[PDB]
């Protein structure tokens, strides 16, 4: 029958492509081109409306949601015909404005169809519901197929990447970005799982490389993931996995790079948030020997660093995860000594935050107020209690005093530093397991980081990640430019414009260049006299006249605006110097270096310097060099709502993501050329009062400037 092309997907079909019956019925639905449109809306960005009247200047209409609106004609936007309902590749739409895109994804999502292409982009909308589309039957059905030969699916990106690698003898890249809760990690896991399922086996820790690559997740997640408002299993670090292959797709090796762990979370949680999972995994009591080994109770509320917000989360069984974490470490080849050391240090951070301090009666100086929790920290860290507390009270050379606030601050900074270093070391250790003697030719790199971030409060962390997405969006634009070029060249159309990647340089230069934002930040970090306001003066003095992308802040207090590709972002500048330098109590670091616990010693052997900014620049450069040696593939994750509600879509929220993630950006840059291209000659066009500069003739197709087809199918 008409659906025979879908038969191989079995029960997954209703979630991949709607049947031919539904297709032809949708096509007969009542549709007047002139009446059925999109207009702007206050509460819900855009809304499908039916035109009731014209003014001669304005238009009034009947809103979906049952309202009457009066708008300027300029604001009215045409709907795509029923022919285009739930289209699989949105580049094939006649009208490619904001509403057209939003509604095509909304109609797919309403129908439980989670995957859509938009030129190069695979777009994924979080279902918040398990769908039967990740079965062996679906895997079998994607093997060796081209994009156009199967409905949209994350499996298509995976299989094609693997196939491109073998066919073109070339590194591949899968960039999976989006907001917190969008689905980045779910899709990342599917992609890795897919390679492990299909990759060839190469010549002969525990089990197989496939086992080990996958078991890397439960290990990182315990220490790097946490409950946030947005996401029960939020990744609080960016991740880049290169899976290496040999000649015929033999799984050869893998390596993991992690970026910008959230040190703050170690010691602080907002009302509705938790610390990293591991703390609650250990406290679940599932492994009773750990409470005794860590000198700890089962009550998170006994521990100040980890109980400032939430403690439990219904979706997570912390006890089962502890066994998941521990198993992972076993599979990954970690020794008892190595596992116990990380548990000990986790426990030590727990006790560290319970050290209380008081003022000397006749002095403005801090002393310990009880020392039991200090004793437990020192024993676990292989340190001397007295030395530790001496160090914290009287940092040493010349000897400085400390009030309680200073010691409490120093305590928190040290705990964060220890946690961060442990996480890095763990990643380094997993890399040792994943290293093999097997021969490599190519890799496929999978990137899982948060996309572009515009919050109510934007600080240093936001600048860093927004800087990354600028380079990633440029990377996309450049790739898009090369493809559009090959295409105009192949079909024989002389086209001219500057590299699409260049459109992002001015912003990047402002951030990246010598005497740019990062450089000014790092130069100020050299001066002990420098302050937040001296830093803010220095940026302004260098840029407010000179760099168009640097502006006054629009009126939570912000200090300057950056014009990014994704919009104008206001930045708060308080604390950037400290964030960047991360000064520690050197006397206590000296003790860490001399610890009887091998791990602690290791974590501080190589110690200041390198600022957060310069480390970020070093990592981003490495990333970009890898990605540039690569055929890239682009996966855009979208979160549909704030309430975890399956099949429900908030329009302004999806619209915000589309503006920030490249989907609208890609549409915009293709608009510079001739986006609509249809296969068949020149006499018919020359026989119309139509604007003659709006079209060009190619070998296979005729190329149209956007809006010609709009006026062509209209006349039809
Ligand atoms: N394809 C899917 N099917 C079913 N549930 C999903 C899917 N994608 C995401 N989810 C749900 O959404 C949650 C969060 O997705 P996840 O991949 O962790 O988001 P993320 O983009 O990594 N956000 P973050 O890591 O915080 O930046 C998951 O735990 C699932 O419950
Ligand atoms: Mn994640």
Swiss-Prot record:
Quaternary structure note? Muscle myosin is a hexameric protein that consists of 2 heavy chain subunits (MHC), 2 alkali light chain subunits (MLC) and 2 regulatory light chain subunits (MLC-2). Interacts with ECPAS. Interacts (via C-terminus) with LRRC39.
Quote the disease note of the record. Cardiomyopathy, familial hypertrophic, 1: A hereditary heart disorder characterized by ventricular hypertrophy, which is usually asymmetric and often involves the interventricular septum. The symptoms include dyspnea, syncope, collapse, palpitations, and chest pain. They can be readily provoked by exercise. The disorder has inter- and intrafamilial variability ranging from benign to malignant forms with high risk of cardiac failure and sudden cardiac death. Congenital myopathy 7A, myosin storage, autosomal dominant: A skeletal muscle disorder characterized by prominent axial and proximal weakening, spinal stiffness, severe scoliosis, with or without respiratory and cardiac involvement. The age at symptom onset can range from early childhood to late adulthood, and disease severity ranges from asymptomatic to severe muscular weakness and respiratory insufficiency. Histopathological examination shows variable findings including subsarcolemmal hyaline bodies in type 1 fibers.
**Effect noted on mutating residue 428 to M:** In MPD1; uncertain significance
Superkingdom, according to UniProt? Eukaryota
**Portion of the full-length sequence here:** 2 to 777 of 1935
Q: Consequence of mutating residue 115 to H?
A: In CMH1; uncertain significance
Q: Where is this region: Actin-binding?
A: 620-642, 696-710
What effect is documented for mutating residue 26 to V?
A: In CMH1; benign
Give the consequence of mutating residue 502 to V: In CMH1; infrequent
Sites where the protein binds ATP: 178-185
Additional remark text? The cardiac alpha isoform is a 'fast' ATPase myosin, while the beta isoform is a 'slow' ATPase.
According to its UniProt entry, what is the function of this protein?
Answer: Myosins are actin-based motor molecules with ATPase activity essential for muscle contraction. Forms regular bipolar thick filaments that, together with actin thin filaments, constitute the fundamental contractile unit of skeletal and cardiac muscle.
The protein's name in its UniProt record: Myosin-7
Family, per entry: Belongs to the TRAFAC class myosin-kinesin ATPase superfamily. Myosin family.
Q: Which residues carry this modification: N6,N6,N6-trimethyllysine?
A: 129
Annotated Myosin N-terminal SH3-like domain residues: 32-81
Task: Give the Phosphothreonine positions (modified residues).
Answer: 371
Annotated Myosin motor domain ranges read 85-716
Q: Which residues cross the membrane?
A: none
Its annotated compartments are: Cytoplasm, Myofibril; Cytoplasm, Myofibril, Sarcomere
Question: Per the entry's comment, what about the domains?
Answer: The rodlike tail sequence is highly repetitive, showing cycles of a 28-residue repeat pattern composed of 4 heptapeptides, characteristic for alpha-helical coiled coils. Limited proteolysis of myosin heavy chain produces 1 light meromyosin (LMM) and 1 heavy meromyosin (HMM). HMM can be further cleaved into 2 globular subfragments (S1) and 1 rod-shaped subfragment (S2).
């Amino acid at each position: 029958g008409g659906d025979s092309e879908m038969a191989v997907f079995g029960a997954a079909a209703p979630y991949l492509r709607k049947s031919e019956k539904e297709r032809l019925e949708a096509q007969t639905r009542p549709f007047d081109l002139k009446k059925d449109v999109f207009v702007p809306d206050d509460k819900q960005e855009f809304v499908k409306a039916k035109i009731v009247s014209r003014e001669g200047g304005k238009v009034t209409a009947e809103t979906e949601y049952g309202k009457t609106v009066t708008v300027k004609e300029d604001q009215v936007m045409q709907q795509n015909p029923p022919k285009f309902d739930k289209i699989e590749d949105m580049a094939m739409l006649t009208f490619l404005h904001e509403p057209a895109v939003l509604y095509n994804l909304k109609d797919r999502y309403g129908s439980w169809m989670i995957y859509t292409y938009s030129g190069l982009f695979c777009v994924t909308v979080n279902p918040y519901k398990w769908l039967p589309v990740y079965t062996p039957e679906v895997v079998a059905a994607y093997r060796g197929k081209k994009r156009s030969e199967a409905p949209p699916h994350i499996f298509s990106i995976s299989d094609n990447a693997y196939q491109y690698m073998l066919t073109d003898r070339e590194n591949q890249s899968i960039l999976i970005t989006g907001e917190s809760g969008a689905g980045k990690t779910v899709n990342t896991k599917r992609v890795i799982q897919y390679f492990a399922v299909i990759a060839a086996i190469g010549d002969r820790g525990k089990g197989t490389l496939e086992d080990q690559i996958i078991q890397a997740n439960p290990a990182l997640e315990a220490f790097g993931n946490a409950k946030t408002v947005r996401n029960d299993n939020s990744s609080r670090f960016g991740k880049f996995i290169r899976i290496h292959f040999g000649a015929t797709g033999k799984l050869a090796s893998a390596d993991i790079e992690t970026y910008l762990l959230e040190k703050s979370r170690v010691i602080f949680q907002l009302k509705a948030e938790r610390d990293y999972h591991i703390f609650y995994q250990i406290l679940s009591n599932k492994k009773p020997e750990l409470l005794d080994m860590l000198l700890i109770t089962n009550n998170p509320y006994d521990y100040a660093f980890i109980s400032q917000g939430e403690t439990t989360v219904a979706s997570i069984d912390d006890a089962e995860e502890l066994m998941a974490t521990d198993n992972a470490f076993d599979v990954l080849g970690f020794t008892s000594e190595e596992k116990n050391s990380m548990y000990k240090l986790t426990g030590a951070i727990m006790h560290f935050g319970n050290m209380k301090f008081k003022l000397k009666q006749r002095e403005e100086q801090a002393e310990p107020d009880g020392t039991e929790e200090a004793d437990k920290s020192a024993y676990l860290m292989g340190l001397n209690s007295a030395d530790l507390l001496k160090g914290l009270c009287h940092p040493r050379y010349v000897t400085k005093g400390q009030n309680v606030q200073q010691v409490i601050y120093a305590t928190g900074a040290l705990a964060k530093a220890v946690y961060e270093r442990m996480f890095n070391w763990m990643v380094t250790r997993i890399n040792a397991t994943l290293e093999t003697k097997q021969p490599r030719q190519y890799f496929i790199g999978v990137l899982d980081i948060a996309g572009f971030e515009i919050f109510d409060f934007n600080s240093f962390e936001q600048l860093c990640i927004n800087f990354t997405n600028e380079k990633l969006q440029q990377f996309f634009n450049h790739h898009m430019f090369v493809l559009e070029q090959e295409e105009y060249k192949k079909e024989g159309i002389e086209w001219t414009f500057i590299d699409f990647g260049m459109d992002l340089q001015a912003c990047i230069d402002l951030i990246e260049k010598p005497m740019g934002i990062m450089s000014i930040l790092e130069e100020e970090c050299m001066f002990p006299k420098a302050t937040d306001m001296t830093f803010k003066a220095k940026l302004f003095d260098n840029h407010l006249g000179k760099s168009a992308n640097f502006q006054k802040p629009r009126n939570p207090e912000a200090h300057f605006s950056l014009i990014h590709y994704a919009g104008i972002v206001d930045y708060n500048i308080i604390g950037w110097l400290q964030k960047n330098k991360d000064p520690l109590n050197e006397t206590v670091v000296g003790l860490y270096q001399k610890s009887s616990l091998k791990l602690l010693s290791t974590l501080f052997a190589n110690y200041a310097f390198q600022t957060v900014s310069a480390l970020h620049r070093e990592n981003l450069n490495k990333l970009m060099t890898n990605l540039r040696s690569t055929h890239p593939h682009f996966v855009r994750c979208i979160i549909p709502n704030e309430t975890k509600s399956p099949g429900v879509m908030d329009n302004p929220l999806v619209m915000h993501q589309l503006r920030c993630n490249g989907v609208l950006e890609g549409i915009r840059i293709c608009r510079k050329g001739f986006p609509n291209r249809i296969l068949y000659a020149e006499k018919l066009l020359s026989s119309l009062d139509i604007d003659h500069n709006q079209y060009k003739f190619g070998h296979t197709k005729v190329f149209f400037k956007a809006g010609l087809l709009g006026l062509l199918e209209e006349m039809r």
